[PDB]
Symmetry: C3
């Protein structure tokens, strides 16, 4: 079985064994979440979303339509994703931009991931980074101060 906190609103049945979903999360019906994930408090997970096994999503993260997270990924707290490069209110894209975070990658706290991005296997994104270009597998990327 999986653990859905009574204070979460989880509408998806597609949740793997061992997964924990914590307080004040929203998970919409078509989301797919694998086994042994930890979806920490205050997250939002939309419909066209696939999350693999052993994924950690720390607090305050939103996973939009068009985003896939592979197995063993770590997403730091308050990490932000995008599916629309030129957002204008009520101007809905015909197709959302896709992001994929590949197996074992880690995204540091409060990073910002632009739309259409691939982050390669086992990459490490520094805390607070702005990722405007793909990050190669196993690369450590951060936004220099």
């Amino acid at each position: 079985g999986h653990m859905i906190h009574k204070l979460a609103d989880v509408q998806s049945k597609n949740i793997g064994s061992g997964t924990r979903i914590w307080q004040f999360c929203v998970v919409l019906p078509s989301a797919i979440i694998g086994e042994n994930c930890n979806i920490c408090s205050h997250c939002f997970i939309e419909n066209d979303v696939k999350i693999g096994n052993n994924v950690t999503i720390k607090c305050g993260v939103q996973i939009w339509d068009g985003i896939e997270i592979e197995d063993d990924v770590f997403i730091g707290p308050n990490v932000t994703f995008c599916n629309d490069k030129y957002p204008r209110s009520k101007q809905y894209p015909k197709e959302f931009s896709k992001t994929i975070i590949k197996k074992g990658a880690s995204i540091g706290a409060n990073a910002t991931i632009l739309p259409g991005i691939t982050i390669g296997e086992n990459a490490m994104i520094g805390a607070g980074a702005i990722v405007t270009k793909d990050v190669l597998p196993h690369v450590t990327y951060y936004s220099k101060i």
Copy 2:
């Protein structure tokens, strides 16, 4: 009518037709929100706040006292606003700094807007930007990496 999610705490009656306010939002009594807005999950909206029509506020945003959002504005997820330039705990300003986000402007995901800022009509703020100065109408501004 408007749609207030049962899992929101909306204390304002000043909400326009067609507006949606989603799970785990807090809206304090004096907030004014126009028609056909979408206030996504996990937002906080204070009292001295005016939000126009057709405004999109993505998840995880707080709109403080002193902030006005005009019509047709898009605010990306985890965008942060300020009303106090030199904050010190329990040192309450006599007057909060005012921010105005003008008609049709868009603010990218996880941007940070300093206090006292004007963002001009139809401007575009890049994801993750720090906005320390006014942005002119129709300008695209981002914080270079």
Copy 3:
């Protein structure tokens, strides 16, 4: 007495007189919170956490195991902290990195604080800053654009 909002999940008994904890907060059992604090909506506070007196934590902040906040500190909205410098999903550190935010310091909105950091007494961290090194007492630090 202290004020715990009915829409918060506060599991700690260690909360000082005059403290307010707002909607959609999570506070785990071992957290220590002093007197006259304001823990604004949408915060998460873990177990190995000490927060002093007269502390303001604005919305959307998480205080992890290993973090101490001294008296009279201001933490801006969506400020992010870290306790793991090289995070990998399911690779639990033997010991979390410690952060201390010293008396009277202020952290601007949407700043990112790396693990192992000391922010000195009465320092001021600019909105959106990435703090990768200790900040001396009374220093104003921001990430230049």
